[PDB]
Amino acid sequence: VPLEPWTAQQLQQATQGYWHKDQIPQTEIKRILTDSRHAESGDAFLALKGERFDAHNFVAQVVANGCQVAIVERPIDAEIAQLVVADTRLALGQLGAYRREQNAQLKVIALTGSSGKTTTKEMLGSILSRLAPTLITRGNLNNDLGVPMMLLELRKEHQYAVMELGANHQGEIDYTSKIVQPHVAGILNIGTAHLGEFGGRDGICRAKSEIYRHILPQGVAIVPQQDDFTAEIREAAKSHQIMSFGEGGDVFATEIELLPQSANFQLHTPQGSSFVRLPFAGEHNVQNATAAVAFALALGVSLEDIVKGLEQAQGAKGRLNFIQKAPHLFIDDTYNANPTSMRAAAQVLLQQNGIKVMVMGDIGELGDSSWQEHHDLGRDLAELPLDHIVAVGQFASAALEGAGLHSTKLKAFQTQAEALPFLINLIQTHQPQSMSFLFKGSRFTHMETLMADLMEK
Ligand SMILES: Nc1ncnc2c1ncn2[C@@H]1O[C@H](COP(=O)(O)OP(=O)(O)OP(=O)(O)O)[C@@H](O)[C@H]1O
Numbered sequence: 001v002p003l004e005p006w007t008a009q010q011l012q013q014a015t016q017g018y019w020h021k022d023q024i025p026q027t028e029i030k031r032i033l034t035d036s037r038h039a040e041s042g043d044a045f046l047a048l049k050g051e052r053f054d055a056h057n058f059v060a061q062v063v064a065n066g067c068q069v070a071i072v073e074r075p076i077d078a079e080i081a082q083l084v085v086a087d088t089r090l091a092l093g094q095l096g097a098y099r100r101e102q103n104a105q106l107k108v109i110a111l112t113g114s115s116g117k118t119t120t121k122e123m124l125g126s127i128l129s130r131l132a133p134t135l136i137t138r139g140n141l142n143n144d145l146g147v148p149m150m151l152l153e154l155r156k157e158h159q160y161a162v163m164e165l166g167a168n169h170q171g172e173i174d175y176t177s178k179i180v181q182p183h184v185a186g187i188l189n190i191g192t193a194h195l196g197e198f199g200g201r202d203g204i205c206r207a208k209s210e211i212y213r214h215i216l217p218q219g220v221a222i223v224p225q226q227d228d229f230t231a232e233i234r235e236a237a238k239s240h241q242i243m244s245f246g247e248g249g250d251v252f253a254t255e256i257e258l259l260p261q262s263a264n265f266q267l268h269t270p271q272g273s274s275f276v277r278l279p280f281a282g283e284h285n286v287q288n289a290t291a292a293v294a295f296a297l298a299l300g301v302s303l304e305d306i307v308k309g310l311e312q313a314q315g316a317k318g319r320l321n322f323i324q325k326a327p328h329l330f331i332d333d334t335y336n337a338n339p340t341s342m343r344a345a346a347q348v349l350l351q352q353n354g355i356k357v358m359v360m361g362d363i364g365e366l367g368d369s370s371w372q373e374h375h376d377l378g379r380d381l382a383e384l385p386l387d388h389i390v391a392v393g394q395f396a397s398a399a400l401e402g403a404g405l406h407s408t409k410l411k412a413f414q415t416q417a418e419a420l421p422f423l424i425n426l427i428q429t430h431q432p433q434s435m436s437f438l439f440k441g442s443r444f445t446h447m448e449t450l451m452a453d454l455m456e457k
């Protein structure tokens, strides 16, 4: 915020809807929201429906709260101006697309990939915000509804927009990218497909490849040079000018030095080279950095400004955020977690100093291997130079059993409420000594709360 307001005319024109009983708002709309709990005077309540729910059911609530404007699929019997449209989900997409179009001064990026989307997006935001007002995706608003919701936040001051697209299924990326109308778009990588997921990895590649379809004239397609699908992705982008990142590509890194909380490397590009002291840890973040560089070069940003942007960029919440507290270290890497990611984080914890204790949560999405996965993990993780391995969750016992000849190193737990005391006690268990805490786990375990609860102590 703030938000550039809408006039009744603009709302009507973008959706081609009609004002119920000719009741046209005489004041502008300051905001368009879908949450009936927050709609107030000046807002336009957009009623969405879906699997087992229909926000049209809550229109009386926004009316009671002062809201006098709503965007609906069917006229409701209540005292409120109503812009009637055929489909409110499509109308939302049209409102975002219309605002995007009205902001002709924008240079737009759209990116996707199986991993590193948010990090790369943050890196670009850092680079571009140094130059001019820039709007980047917030949180996970990267789907059919999220993308347009973000575009509603565009303002005349914005010169750049970095839109993250997180869809993985056929036709989804075409939908959101068409709304976005990017000048530069591309794919970071193609990961693994869900167990039994229709299409497999090939399906993810075809889905994400839809991101090249609506690149504007004289635009640029960014492609990953080191991915199992590089050849297929290059073919999909053949109708556009191409720039690549990764080994053997246009933008790549050499002499990488992985430091405890950062990474050093020599950056190579068609616009020259430069050393980079990247304030992010791990090789994956170096790869994300190279992608950000390619995306930025495609927008005409100088190499000098790109490096400056990278060196002062900050990671997203829950993505390896180093929090130093007294002689103790707290690495908040709770955003999400998977098979690999969990073992990778363990290492980063090792590269640190003092007493290493990895507070992990449930890795949620291994259907039946939830026991087998956590079993082997706790086995290999407890086999590392790690000191203590606190495991919280329903499959925490699966890790304790897997520990095997390392059961004295791992102590399972069902809840944070039960584990918290163990960490507080384990703190003094080592008297005044430095300790490195690394909190990981799937998004639903919200391990950041436990970490916050332990730090607030
Ligand atoms: N290039 C990469 N390859 C593989 N994993 C990565 C890469 N960059 C980051 N990660 C891993 O992905 C996790 C999330 O990173 P990030 O939020 O940037 O990705 P994302 O693609 O936005 O996630 P989501 O799919 O939920 O949108 C990190 O904790 C990290 O382990």
Ligand SMILES: O=c1ccn([C@@H]2O[C@H](COP(=O)(O)OP(=O)(O)O)[C@@H](O)[C@H]2O)c(=O)[nH]1
Residues within 6 Å of the ligand: 034, 035, 036, 048, 049, 050, 051, 053, 054, 055, 145
């Ligand atoms: O009771 C509800 C359920 C959903 N929504 C809105 O409708 C959107 C889409 O909901 P859906 O269940 O279709 O997808 P989800 O967001 O849960 O993935 C959400 O982002 C909300 O903004 C709402 O207003 N009330």
Ligand SMILES: [Mg+2]
Residues within 6 Å of the ligand: 117, 118, 139, 140, 142, 164, 166
């Ligand atoms: Mg994301």
